[PDB]
RNA sequence: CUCCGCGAGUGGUCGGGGUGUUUACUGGGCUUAAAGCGCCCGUAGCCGGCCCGGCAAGUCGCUCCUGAAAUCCCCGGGCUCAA
RNA sequence: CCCCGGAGGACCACCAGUGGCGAAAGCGGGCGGCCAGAACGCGCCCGACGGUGAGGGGCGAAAGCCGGGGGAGCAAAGGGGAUUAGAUACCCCUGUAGUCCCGGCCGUAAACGAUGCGGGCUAGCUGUCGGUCGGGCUUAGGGCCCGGCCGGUGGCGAAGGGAAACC
């Protein structure tokens, strides 16, 4: 839910106050960009790509080493998502919930979860239309947006 | 702060770490520094109840 | 974590650790709280297993960065 | 660091044994030193010694007659008794009569300028009257004690008979030395063991 | 009189000759005789007198509850309450408690429509409260007078205040609570961190 | 959701002063908070002001001198004129010699005394006494 | 005026309770607000001299719980009307 | 009978303001006194993180053209003062 | 009453708690599948995208209504046996809707924490739940104990507040 939740957690990562390049790093900025483009072509989304760089390759953060952001690097290197990552995730979640609701029409909890997800989709669409990252004629039609699932 | 206001009456003892005055009908506590005994330590009843620490201006002792 | 208004300078509680793979002997840099199965880049064996907290290491811990 | 009494005597009397509770106040002050894997709180014995020294200097500056030393703990009846017999202070073991400091029309109406309670969590009535009248208060506090209205505290194991007897003997010796009837070398006429109650 | 309580001993021995020193050094007055010794010019007034009853099997047992305000008219005021079966000792008890509860009152100017540096009014804006009567005292220009209720005027005049503006809230018809709230504000003049 | 850092910082200072603390830590901060603290320190209500460079915008550690009797941010931020300063003076302060209003003007954040000296007006921010 | 901070039942952060049926009754209440007094219980008490260690006669005891509403809990003396100060005392209900 | 208040006035009933912090901007309250919609999604509206650069709309300062006269506040003068 | 078999409808005893989940209503046997929403850990991604929300909505106990199925126990209405001055009640026997399932309507409740939602600051002590970190042990287990943080859930209680109960 969004309002009147039972709990209000604090879980989040605490980064250094001003991140810098690690002294122990064995990867140059250009090699970091090629590794990111490799993971993108393999198909991981940007959050997963960042986790992969941090875990497997020991890259703490793309921004200090390269001066850019991960989606900026992917955009420069010929990788352009259809929609923004969070909006696409919300739309896929809504499509999965609707597919479930097709065979289970009396799942009122699932209907409320779908309403929450669709409201989040609407807020994100309002923001993206305001900032120009999506076309101003974009409309959330789940029947015509099945291809994104 | 205060600009040329001459406020009457007895002045109150001032708390030596918070400036909470020992008001009439409320009894604070005034003693000498336990480590030295040179400076005076004044604790209003609020600071005594709250356990507010006090520091000697002369020595480096912090007491209840 | 704690409250940002209570901690003076918040810092990352995790750390980066160098590992030596026991099979081949390659050294690798790896996040301590690895949220995935981290493998050796050469032989391919598993070096770190993910948990809900600090990851479990199968390779020798050469030094914590 | 140089001790009022030897560390073997201290750690045999168990003065630095605290209750297994929590006390964020004492922890922030730094009187808590180490907690074992069974949850037992251990004080800093060096801080214990330094607070004994400063406390002895505190009681030394007051006339002994105007200092009231009180406990309701029966374990502290005897150590406070010999401490106070050797210093010359209004002593009180047993029940603190309410209104002794606030009711001047009472037969036992004492007038004091310093109060010394063995345990403030049990000797609450004396602490309450001291707060109401504005009398300075000294207390042998541990993890369970409430710190309100205590102008001076000595974090120590105020439960055991051995700890109480050793602490009171050390305080009596230091107060005698500060008053001047004893130089810094002599000891009391009786050992610490006579302070321990029976 | 026997100087019961050691402060009374010093006061009768003349080591303390003025009432200002007690409130300067935070000394607690436990006896009224110190007050009559150090303030011979103390005027006491009967602010309120209510009849009060307890129900019992044989009928109500009545007791007078008298409220008394004592003051020197020079910055010293106190108010006390006395319950007694008869009015005379009720007033005596109230006078004794007022004398025990006497306190200094800080005075001065501070009104925007005045510039005199005299003790005619309160030095700053102060508040007091007793149960539900809240009384805010505000400094006023000289010559305005006491702009409070009647019992508030009596308490302020006894405390030695000439001009003031009042702002009250709650049932002021509770005369005891109104008097206590006004006295509370006058005592709260000393809680201001100058 | 956090709305006004100035009112948040002022009420935090008031809470710490009520509890009789020696220092209050102020997070998040802005230049308005810094200039308000500067005016308070200039008039003595607030002691030393140390900046802390945490990554999340900065923090201010302020020393308290036992001088505040009541503090608070006037909200809404009312536009006040030089001829209108005095009624807000009487509205928020006790005594004609005690306390100060804080004003944001085109020459910067200052006290109501300095605003009346410069013969200017502006936006009311807070009060101290 | 609100008697008790418990609402008369230690229910917990929930909206509805499964609720039970009273013994010798049926007025009753949910799982909380009911009395669940336990007794040791055994058939034929003190015949252990004339049975048990005679013949072979192996007996059994069965701890038994009885559930009562407030009316029956007051009626069989399992609950008294304690004073206001003693209302917050934590005592076990005689097993 | 005598005393009290105002007096060429003094009373009755109405309407407005005060009363009234009982309309609350200053400045009320909503556990139990009247008062939190059974719960949640969200449109308009209102309220909104930090830093830097531009503008100068709100805002602030001065000035000008104005906001009829009478009325209102201050000052001087003339009706014997007064109005 | 006891035994041997079959059929049917409801519920999920103890464990079990001011224990958990959920926005509220509400949710208590096991296994499986399909979903949802949180907490915790994180040098993951976006970069203010947020709050509240008139109007407008959607969900919403019990009883009740519409149509279909089912019906063990209980049981409004009703019948009978008692009691009483009366007894159209309270007690006993019995008994139909209803209670259960499916589709819809109803849209109410002491729908209550009688406490709108969001965020910050302000002593503590103590039980318990989830995650996580440090130490010790180990029914060597996803285990137990102590200490810290984060997030819930109870108790007492600083400052403060209140007409007071009290928070
Ligand atoms: Mg919006
Ligand atoms: Mg514990
Ligand atoms: Mg309910
Ligand atoms: Mg009202
Ligand atoms: Mg009501
Ligand atoms: Mg509600
Ligand atoms: Mg309604
Ligand atoms: Mg309703
Ligand atoms: Mg402009
Ligand atoms: Mg909303
Ligand atoms: Mg609506
Ligand atoms: Mg139904
Ligand atoms: Mg039937
Ligand atoms: Mg039947
Ligand atoms: Mg309600
Ligand atoms: Mg109320
Ligand atoms: Zn010193
Ligand atoms: Zn390898
Ligand atoms: Zn004046
Ligand atoms: Zn029953």
From Swiss-Prot, chain A:
Superkingdom field: Archaea
Q: Name one GO molecular function term.
A: small ribosomal subunit rRNA binding
Matching entries from InterPro entries are given as: Ribosomal_uS15, Ribosomal_uS15_arc_euk, Ribosomal_uS15_N, uS15_NS1_RNA-bd_sf
Q: How does it assemble?
A: Part of the 30S ribosomal subunit.
What's the protein here called?
A: Small ribosomal subunit protein uS15
What the entry lists under HAMAP family is as follows: Ribosomal_uS15_A
Would I find Transcription regulation among this entry's keywords?
Answer: no
| Keywords on record | Ribonucleoprotein, Ribosomal protein
List the residue ranges of the region (Disordered).
1-23
> Pfam families attached here?
Ribosomal_S13_N (PF08069), Ribosomal_S15 (PF00312)
Classification via NCBIfam families: PRK08561.1
Q: Which family is this sequence assigned to?
A: Belongs to the universal ribosomal protein uS15 family.
- UniProt record, GO biological process: translation
Task: Return the Basic residues bias intervals.
Answer: 1-10
GO CC annotation? cytosolic small ribosomal subunit
From Swiss-Prot, chain C:
User: Where along the chain is Zn(2+) bound?
Assistant: 21, 24, 40, 43
Q: Which Gene Ontology BP annotations are present?
A: translation
Domain of life from the UniProt record: Archaea
Co-factor note (free text)? Binds 1 zinc ion per subunit.
Signal peptide, first to last residue: none
HAMAP family membership: Ribosomal_eS27
Recorded hits in SUPFAM superfamilies, A to Z, give:
Zn-binding ribosomal proteins (SSF57829)
Zinc finger map (C4-type) = 21-43
Family, similarity comment: Belongs to the eukaryotic ribosomal protein eS27 family.
Looking up Pfam families in the UniProt record yields: Ribosomal_S27e
- Summary of subunit composition and partner proteins: Part of the 30S ribosomal subunit.
Q: Which UniProt keywords apply?
A: Metal-binding, Ribonucleoprotein, Ribosomal protein, Zinc, Zinc-finger
PANTHER family in the record: 40S RIBOSOMAL PROTEIN S27
Q: Which cofactor does it need?
A: Zn(2+)
Indicate what this protein is called per its UniProt record: Small ribosomal subunit protein eS27
Entries under InterPro entries matching the protein: Ribosomal_eS27, Ribosomal_eS27_Zn-bd_dom_sf, Ribosomal_zn-bd
Q: Give the CC-aspect GO terms.
A: ribonucleoprotein complex; ribosome
A single GO molecular function term of this UniProt record:
zinc ion binding
Curated annotation (Swiss-Prot), chain E:
Q: Using the record for this protein, list the coiled-coil segments as residue ranges, or answer none.
A: none
Task: Provide a Gene Ontology MF annotation, just one.
Answer: structural constituent of ribosome
Keyword match Lipoprotein: no
Q: Name one GO cellular component term.
A: cytosolic small ribosomal subunit
Family from the record: Belongs to the universal ribosomal protein uS5 family.
Q: Which InterPro entries does the entry mention?
A: Ribosomal_Su5_D2-typ_SF, Ribosomal_uS5, Ribosomal_uS5_arc, Ribosomal_uS5_C, Ribosomal_uS5_euk/arc, Ribosomal_uS5_N, Ribosomal_uS5_N_CS, Ribsml_uS5_D2-typ_fold_subgr
Keyword set, alphabetical order? Ribonucleoprotein, Ribosomal protein, RNA-binding, rRNA-binding
> What is the recorded name of this protein?
Small ribosomal subunit protein uS5
Subunit annotation: Part of the 30S ribosomal subunit. Contacts protein S4.
Q: What is the lineage of its organism?
A: Archaea, Thermoproteota, Thermoprotei, Thermoproteales, Thermoproteaceae
This molecule's function is given as: With S4 and S12 plays an important role in translational accuracy.
Q: Which HAMAP family match?
A: Ribosomal_uS5_A
Cystine residue pairs: none
Q: Per the entry's comment, what about the domains?
A: The N-terminal domain interacts with the head of the 30S subunit; the C-terminal domain interacts with the body and contacts protein S4. The interaction surface between S4 and S5 is involved in control of translational fidelity.
Q: Where is the S5 DRBM domain?
A: 42-105
Q: Which residues form the signal peptide?
A: none
Name the Gene Ontology biological process terms: translation
UniProtKB/Swiss-Prot annotation, chain F:
Keyword set for this entry?
A: Ribonucleoprotein, Ribosomal protein, RNA-binding, rRNA-binding
Superkingdom, natural source: Archaea
User: Which GO molecular function annotations are given, in alphabetical order?
Assistant: rRNA binding; structural constituent of ribosome
- Coiled coil spans: none
* UniProt cross-references to InterPro entries, sorted A to Z: Ribosomal_uS8, Ribosomal_uS8_CS, Ribosomal_uS8_sf
GO terms (BP aspect): translation
Q: Which GO CC terms are listed, alphabetically?
A: ribonucleoprotein complex; ribosome
Name the family.
Answer: Belongs to the universal ribosomal protein uS8 family.
Question: What does the record give as the function of this protein?
Answer: One of the primary rRNA binding proteins, it binds directly to 16S rRNA central domain where it helps coordinate assembly of the platform of the 30S subunit.
PANTHER family per the UniProt record, alphabetical: 40S RIBOSOMAL PROTEIN S15A
This protein's assembly is summarised as: Part of the 30S ribosomal subunit.
Protein name per Swiss-Prot or TrEMBL? Small ribosomal subunit protein uS8
Q: Which gene encodes it?
A: rps8
